[PDB]
Amino acid sequence: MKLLVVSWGDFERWKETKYRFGGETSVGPSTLPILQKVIKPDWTVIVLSDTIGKDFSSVETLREDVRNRVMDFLDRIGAGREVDVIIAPGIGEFTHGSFRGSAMDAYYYVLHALSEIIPTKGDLEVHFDSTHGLNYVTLLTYRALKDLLGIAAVMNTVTFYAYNSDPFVPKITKELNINTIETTMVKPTPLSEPLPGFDEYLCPYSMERAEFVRLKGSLNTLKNLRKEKKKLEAWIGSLLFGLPLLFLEEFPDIGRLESYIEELAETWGGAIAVNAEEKAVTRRLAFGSGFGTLVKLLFQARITRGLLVEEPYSIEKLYSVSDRLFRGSTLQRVRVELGKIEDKAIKYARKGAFPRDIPLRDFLGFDNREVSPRNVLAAAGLEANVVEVSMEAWEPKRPEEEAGRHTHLKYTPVGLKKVEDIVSRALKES
Amino acid sequence: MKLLVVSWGDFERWKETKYRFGGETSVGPSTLPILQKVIKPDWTVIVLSDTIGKDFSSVETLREDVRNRVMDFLDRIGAGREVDVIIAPGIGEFTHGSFRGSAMDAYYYVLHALSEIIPTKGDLEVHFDSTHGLNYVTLLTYRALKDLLGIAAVMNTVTFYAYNSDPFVPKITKELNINTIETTMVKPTPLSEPLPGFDEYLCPYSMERAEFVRLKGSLNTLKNLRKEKKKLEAWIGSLLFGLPLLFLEEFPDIGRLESYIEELAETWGGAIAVNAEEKAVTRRLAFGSGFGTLVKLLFQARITRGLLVEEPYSIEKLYSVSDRLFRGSTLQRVRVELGKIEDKAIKYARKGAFPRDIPLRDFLGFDNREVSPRNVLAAAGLEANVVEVSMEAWEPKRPEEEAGRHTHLKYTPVGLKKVEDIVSRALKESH
Ligand SMILES: Nc1ncnc2c1ncn2[C@@H]1O[C@H](CO)[C@@H](OP(=O)(O)OC[C@@H]2O[C@H](n3cnc4c(N)ncnc43)[C@H]3OP(=O)(O)O[C@H]32)[C@H]1O
Ligand SMILES: Nc1ncnc2c1ncn2[C@@H]1O[C@H](CO)[C@@H](OP(=O)(O)OC[C@@H]2O[C@H](n3cnc4c(N)ncnc43)[C@H]3OP(=O)(O)O[C@H]32)[C@H]1O
């Protein structure tokens, strides 16, 4: 999949020029047609600021004014069908209107929009045009894109190319090159941040705290999240620290994460006040870092959801999951720990012994019944005192080959809680 | 240390306005005085393009024209003098002249210049203003700054703030707010690139093949690096994979690294052709990714050099090094491995046994003598067939607290070579 993302300011102001890119030539006010010709993207995303809007009756007459103006220009320059337009929350005081709120809302809003567009299956080739962006919207768009691609790179190959034309001097410029300014193979970066305290999903920008405290208290999301926070952190830690059984046992409910994000996104949009007379938009709520963390969390669940199976979890399944998810010394520790349990399973199978629900410590022949954070993290979450082993009997013929399919691991109810506390806490000390 | 970094375009085109920042206001053509007033940085860096330069006699005349004009603009606005000015190789055809070369030269040059300015000891609070920046210069400066700060964050607490003024509307703007657009605790991200093939330090932009081949074959940097490449990669993987003994034993020679980067940077500078007549700069050589890898490698060696010590390396030293470099399950797996070697050291010390030059295999009482990649990486480099143990004889009084200090690890000659192959190959196979 080839994805073209561009960052746009006030496109109506741009002058007709000739662009050079990919041995080709184009005349027009925008880089977009020549980028689309040379790259042949499967999909185009335009990120714009709502600050170019002039119809001030409401949020919807605002978005409609901006959206119609973008499509007029796209048809005029011949941009095409296969385009999403993200109308991001901008700020400032202009001829036609006044826009007030957190400058950082643009990051959370673009992060939320890109998370619903970037495919969560297969390899990505991502192209990014910074030539026409407002500096802060361009920089926040770049960051939002790179944050999501890093998570995508855990499961798939992701490459990223950035472009910028030469600088335009009004009136004297005829021709501009489109330069390549970045070529990267994006590195796998699982989510490495805990969920924050409950004052950090939505923040008052200009809302009186009576209204804020009442609003915060009326949200299902904040209540349900308090309940689930530690299980979700256990899951984030599972990918960051290399704990493949915890990855499967704590795999999050995607429908619940979606509703959390939707409730927060609509509470934010709900607090947007438009004064038709003053031509003034006030985003009385600001997104917090927690909204960002929930969006990255749902994206990561979507990217890895194809690994999930129903219990029970075999050694063979723990190996295959680990091979997709983990790298470096973390993969190799997983393989050592699974290999020791497998080696033992083989010895039992060779004796026609098929123990069930046996504490891992007895399975391995240990005698330190205390659960240590050190050993939970260092042994890939397969600590002797929190895991139960079951071998489902079969007729062994080549036991070396077979034990792995037929040996299952799970956390004991007590063990799972102690692992959740350990992993959650390790995530917060970072 | 508070470091302020500002991305600037053509400062002579900017108009007088009002800015507000930290309940202050300021009048002038630039955010810089009000940023300096509120933040009170210990040091300021200005990044701009040399494509503002007007004097084409020579490379240095051009940089001199740009530096003199920035220093005059600083006087006019009242910024003062405690500033580095990074004059990045920019690109484009302008009325006053033409600037040709790879657009990615600006990333490598700014990475190199920041790598000599960002303090390599202590915490860092870094402030970044994108307000007045060229889009491409701002993106490449932002990336170079984040890349070096991720390395510094391995040793030190690094916080990052980014700012951007409201957009300026030529005849409507009364006053511009300076917005906060990022507030970050920077995450430790050690170098995770191998050194590339030898075509990727300097690349021809507009340089003929006879010249390039002769130039490439004349560089002692490329010959030396072919030789030290695997040991340098073994060091990079030591931080990435959690191998504290390898981190000490392969700690690079900072003198040689400076010389590699100085030679590549001087060859790049010497390939810049300035035609005074038709006012054209051509940067005949482009920087390759290998140049950036070397700069990041040197910067990581500067950041971690406080941990290095003389050769006897104790379990106690390996714990303290690992506590600064490693996190999460990597850190815990180092402590599991050191702990096992430590417990046997305690048992031997209690009985008056002080084994010298003993294979770790014998020390732990093992025995295959085959070295596996899996076991080297999973046991934090401390594989029983590649490590030698020596305990100093001492009179144990509190052996459980004393054994760690007295118990020394080192790779055997053969063992180190095997570990180098394993770590170099694991670095390359995740790129
Ligand atoms: N067809 C188009 N019509 C209008 N703009 C276009 C078009 N195609 C691309 N652009 C770019 O879109 C942004 C909006 O106009 C501009 O890029 P940005 O990076 O925001 O600004 C570059 C300007 O470079 C100007 N400076 C002109 N000389 C040079 C120079 N020789 N060394 C460095 N900067 C130069 C600067 O004056 P300053 O600092 O006040 O504004 C910058 C344009 O270059
Ligand atoms: N004292 C100063 N003198 C001159 N410039 C200053 C000064 N202080 C700050 N600046 C900024 O420095 C860059 C060069 O002048 C400018 O920032 P940049 O982010 O490059 O672009 C501003 C322009 O805002 C334009 N657009 C104007 N309306 C709106 C609008 N209502 N919704 C979204 N964008 C708007 C954008 O369209 P586009 O890409 O053609 O040009 C940009 C200025 O905002």
- In sequence order, what DSSP letters do the residues of A369-419 get, joined into one string? -S--HHHHHHTTT--TTTEEEEEPP---SSHHHHHHHHEEEEE-HHHHHHH
CA-closest candidate to residue B129, choices B30, B23, B43, B53: B30
Distance separating alpha carbons of residues A13 and B57, to the nearest angstrom: 37
- Please name the residue that has the structure tokens 């001199």: B64
Sheet of strand A272-275, all strands in order from the earlier edge strand to the far edge: A92-94, A97-100, A280-283, A272-275
CB contact under 8 A, A93 and B179: no
In our burial notation (b when 16+ CB lie closer than 10 A, e otherwise), range A217-255 reads: eebebbeebeebbbbbbbbbbbbbbbbbbbbbbbbbeee
Q: How many CB atoms lie within 10 A of CB B32?
A: 27
**Is B4:B138 a contact under the CB 8 Å cutoff?**
no
CA-closest candidate to residue B200, choices B295, B293, B63: B293
Q: Is B84 exposed, middle or buried (0-12, 13-18, 19+ CB in 10 A)?
A: middle
Alpha-carbon torsion, ordered B179, B182, B184, B189, to 10 deg: -140
- Residues followed by a gap in chain A, C→N > 2.5 Å: 367
Distance separating alpha carbons of residues A149 and B55, to the nearest angstrom: 43
Distance separating alpha carbons of residues B416 and B410, to the nearest angstrom: 9
Testing the interface with B: which of A18, A131, A146, A181 to mutate, by most B Cβ within 10 A? A181
Distance separating alpha carbons of residues A43 and A356, to the nearest angstrom: 52
**Is A205:A285 a contact under the CB 8 Å cutoff?**
yes
In our burial notation (b when 16+ CB lie closer than 10 A, e otherwise), range B177-216 reads: bbbebbebebebbbbbbbbbebeebbbbbebeeeebeebe
CB contact under 8 A, B179 and A136: yes
CA nearest ligand 2 atom 35, residue:
A10
A430: chain B residues, CB-CB within 8 Å: 187, 327
Helix B105-115 to helix B254-270 angle, to the nearest 10 degrees? 140
- Please name the residue that has the structure tokens 């600021």: A49
Closest chain A CA to residue B424: A328
**Is A132:A11 a contact under the CB 8 Å cutoff?**
yes
Is A87 strand, coil or helix? Answer: strand
Is B187 strand, coil or helix? Answer: coil
Pocket test for ligand 2, best of A10, A13, A91 (most atoms within 8 A of CB): A10
Is B94 strand, coil or helix? Answer: strand
Q: How many CA atoms lie within 13 A of B8 on its CB side?
A: 32
Distance separating alpha carbons of residues B166 and B168, to the nearest angstrom: 6
**Is A265:A112 a contact under the CB 8 Å cutoff?**
yes
Q: Is B172 exposed, middle or buried (0-12, 13-18, 19+ CB in 10 A)?
A: exposed
Q: How many CB atoms lie within 10 A of CB A5?
A: 27
Alpha-carbon torsion, ordered A415, A421, A426, A429, to 10 deg: -160
Q: Output phi, psi for B94, to 5 deg.
A: -120, 170
**Is B89:B109 a contact under the CB 8 Å cutoff?**
yes
Q: Which helix (H) or strand (E) holds B283?
A: strand B280-283
Determine if ligand 1 sits within 6 Å of the CB of residue B10: yes
CATH 3.40.50.10640, chain B: domain bounds:
2-185
- Please name the residue that has the structure tokens 């949200």: A219
Q: CA-CA distances (angstroms) from residue A261 to A232, A292, B303, B380?
A: 14, 9, 40, 40
Alpha-carbon torsion, ordered A416, A420, A422, A427, to 10 deg: 150
Determine if ligand 2 sits within 6 Å of the CB of residue B352: no
CA-closest candidate to residue B386, choices B418, B363, B431, B358: B418
Cis peptide before A312 (omega within 30 of 0): yes
**Is B115:B295 a contact under the CB 8 Å cutoff?**
yes
Q: How many CB atoms lie within 10 A of CB A309?
A: 12
- Name the β-bridge partners of B272: B283
**Is B384:B361 a contact under the CB 8 Å cutoff?**
yes
Phi-psi region of A366 (alpha: psi -120 to 50; beta: other; left: phi over 0): beta
Distance separating alpha carbons of residues A5 and A339, to the nearest angstrom: 45
CB contact under 8 A, A136 and B164: yes
- Residues followed by a gap in chain B, C→N > 2.5 Å: 367
Alpha-carbon torsion, ordered A66, A72, A74, A75, to 10 deg: 160
Q: Helix/strand/coil (H, E, C) string of A150-210? A: HHHCCCCCEEEEEEEECCCCCCCCCEEEEEEEEEEECCCCCCCCCCCCCCCCEEECCCCHH
* Ligand 1 centroid, distance to A168 Cα (angstroms): 4
User: Token pair for residue B239?
Assistant: 């931080």
Phi-psi region of B279 (alpha: psi -120 to 50; beta: other; left: phi over 0): left
**Is A102:B177 a contact under the CB 8 Å cutoff?**
no
When CB atoms are compared, the residue of B192, B243, B336 closest to A378 is B336
Q: How many CA atoms lie within 13 A of B166 on its CB side?
A: 24
User: Token pair for residue A6?
Assistant: 């561009």
Is B142 strand, coil or helix? Answer: helix
Distance separating alpha carbons of residues B321 and B315, to the nearest angstrom: 10
* Ligand 1 centroid, distance to A17 Cα (angstroms): 13
Q: CA-CA distances (angstroms) from residue B384 to A68, B247, B251, B410, B419?
A: 69, 18, 22, 11, 12
Show the CA angle centred on residue A257, arms to residues A255 and A261, nearest 5°.
115
Q: Output phi, psi for A15, to 5 deg.
A: -95, 150
**Is A349:A391 a contact under the CB 8 Å cutoff?**
yes
Q: Which residues contact B97 (CB under 8 A, 6 or more apart)?
A: B53, B54, B56, B279, B280, B281
Among the bound ligands, the one closest to the CA of A28: 1
CA-closest candidate to residue B13, choices B152, B241, B170, B144: B170
Amino acid identity at B153: A
Helix A254-270 to helix A220-241 angle, to the nearest 10 degrees? 130
CB contact under 8 A, B179 and A426: no
Distance separating alpha carbons of residues A149 and A135, to the nearest angstrom: 21
Sheet of strand A83-88, all strands in order from the earlier edge strand to the far edge: A24-28, A17-21, A175-185, A158-165, A124-129, A2-7, A43-49, A83-88
Q: CA-CA distances (angstroms) from residue A122 to A1, A148, A161, B15, B257?
A: 7, 14, 18, 49, 40
User: Token pair for residue A11?
Assistant: 């496109």
Determine if ligand 2 sits within 6 Å of the CB of residue A10: yes
Distance separating alpha carbons of residues A416 and B177, to the nearest angstrom: 50
Q: Are strands A175-185 and B92-94 parallel, antiparallel or unpaired?
A: unpaired
- Superfamily of domain B2-185, CATH level 4: SSO1389-like (3.40.50.10640)
Is B374 strand, coil or helix? Answer: helix
User: Token pair for residue A161?
Assistant: 């190319």
Resolution of the coordinates, Å = 2.1
**Is B298:B341 a contact under the CB 8 Å cutoff?**
no
Q: Which residues contact A35 (CB under 8 A, 6 or more apart)?
A: A4, A6, A21, A41, A127, A129, A163, A178
User: Token pair for residue A280?
Assistant: 């003034």
Distance of CA A126 to the CA centre of its chain: 15
Largest alpha-carbon pair distance within chain A?
88
Q: Which helix (H) or strand (E) holds B246?
A: helix B244-249
Distance separating alpha carbons of residues A339 and A416, to the nearest angstrom: 22
Distance separating alpha carbons of residues A231 and B246, to the nearest angstrom: 36
What is the position in ligand 1's atom list of the atom closest to the CA of A167?
A: 44
**Is B356:B390 a contact under the CB 8 Å cutoff?**
yes
CB contact under 8 A, B143 and A182: yes
- Name the β-bridge partners of B158: B124
Distance separating alpha carbons of residues A405 and A351, to the nearest angstrom: 17
CA-closest candidate to residue A46, choices A12, A16, A87, A75: A87
**Is B146:B24 a contact under the CB 8 Å cutoff?**
no
**Is A146:A299 a contact under the CB 8 Å cutoff?**
no
Taking the CA of residue B317 and the nearest CA in chain A, the distance in Å comes to 19
**Is B330:B242 a contact under the CB 8 Å cutoff?**
yes
Amino acid identity at B308: L
**Is A231:A265 a contact under the CB 8 Å cutoff?**
no
Distance of CA A371 to the CA centre of its chain: 32
Alpha-carbon torsion, ordered A414, A419, A424, A425, to 10 deg: 100
Distance separating alpha carbons of residues A31 and A304, to the nearest angstrom: 35
Q: Is B277 exposed, middle or buried (0-12, 13-18, 19+ CB in 10 A)?
A: exposed
Q: How many CB atoms lie within 10 A of CB A259?
A: 14
Distance separating alpha carbons of residues B178 and A270, to the nearest angstrom: 26
Q: Are strands A285-287 and A202-204 parallel, antiparallel or unpaired?
A: antiparallel
Show the CA angle centred on residue B97, arms to residues B94 and B98, nearest 5°.
80
Determine if ligand 1 sits within 6 Å of the CB of residue B171: no
Is A359 strand, coil or helix? Answer: strand
Closest chain B CA to residue A328: B241
CA-closest candidate to residue A301, choices A260, A259, A247: A247
A185: chain B residues, CB-CB within 8 Å: 431
CA nearest ligand 2 atom 30, residue:
A52
Size (chain A), residues? 430
Q: DSSP assignment of A276-322, as one string?
A: TTTTEEEE-EEE-HHHHHHHHHHHHHHHHGGG--PSPEEHHHHHHHH
Distance of CA A73 to the CA centre of its chain: 31
- Please name the residue that has the structure tokens 């990727």: B200
SS3 content of chain B, % helix, strand, coil (to 5): 50, 20, 30
Q: Which residues contact A190 (CB under 8 A, 6 or more apart)?
A: A151, A154, A236, A239, A240, A300
Segments in B42-120 forming alpha helices (H): 59-77, 105-115
CA nearest ligand 2 atom 26, residue:
A10
**Is B12:B73 a contact under the CB 8 Å cutoff?**
yes
